Each structure stands twice: as C-alpha cells, then as structure tokens.
Design a protein around this ligand. Sequence first.
Ligand code: CA
Lengths: 98, 48
Amino acid sequence: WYIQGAASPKDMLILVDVSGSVSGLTLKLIRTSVSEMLETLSDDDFVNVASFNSNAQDVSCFQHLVQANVRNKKVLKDAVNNITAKGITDYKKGFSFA
Amino acid sequence: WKPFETIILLTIFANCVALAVYLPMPEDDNNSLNLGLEKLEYFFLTVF
Ligand SMILES: [Ca+2]
C-alpha cells in the first residue's frame, strides 16, 4: 500500500553482472538483492531480468518485460538463484541488451 | 663491455615491476592493465 502511492508504476529491468570477479561473497549477495528488489514490484509494474558476462543473455524464459505478478516473479526469483559467475565483464553489451 | 651488463640489469628490474603490478582476478576475468601487461611479456621474452 505504501509503494503504490509512493510513486508511479514502472517498467524496470534488472541487470546482473556475472563476470568472474563477482564470484565469491559478492555473487552470493546479488541473488538476494534481486529477489529483494522484486518484492518491491507490483502487478502494474512490468519487469524482466537480464545478466551479462561479455554477452547479455536473459536469465529465464521470458525475453520481454512481463507483468511481475505473483507467478512471473516466481519464475524470475527461481532463475536468479542458479546463476554461476564466469567470464569477462562487458558493460557495453550489457547496456545494449538492456 | 660496461653498460650491457647494466641495461640487462635494468631490464630485469622492469620485469619485476611488471610481475608486481599484475592483479590476479577470479575466473579468467581481466581489467585492461592486465591485457597490456601480457603484451609486455613478449617484449621481455625476446630481450632475454
Ligand atoms: Ca568484473
């Protein structure tokens, strides 16, 4: 209730950095922030989740911004969890894909 | 004669600073100074 009147609905898009340097304590922290970030999202809010390491793939099956209802968010919170860090960081292919 | 004994003693001190400034990163991840430092290794590999 606080959130819907805080602000206007929003199409967000979470990028996740999956380069090798992140693996460790930091990688562990990211999977819990994104799940946390989602809690914030609402049905009126659309959201997808991407991830980059020298190529930007998209974390799940979706490929476009989806309604971020209870179900869709459940899919994204279940694909954020299985991520493995490997590879070169590329912020240019990560923001092109975004 | 005199300085070839001391330019190759100065080359080797420059090879020990290039091993020092290397920064090891996990999982094959590299910043841009580690890439220019493996281009220095080739130049230190032929002088020796
Ligand atoms: Ca990195």
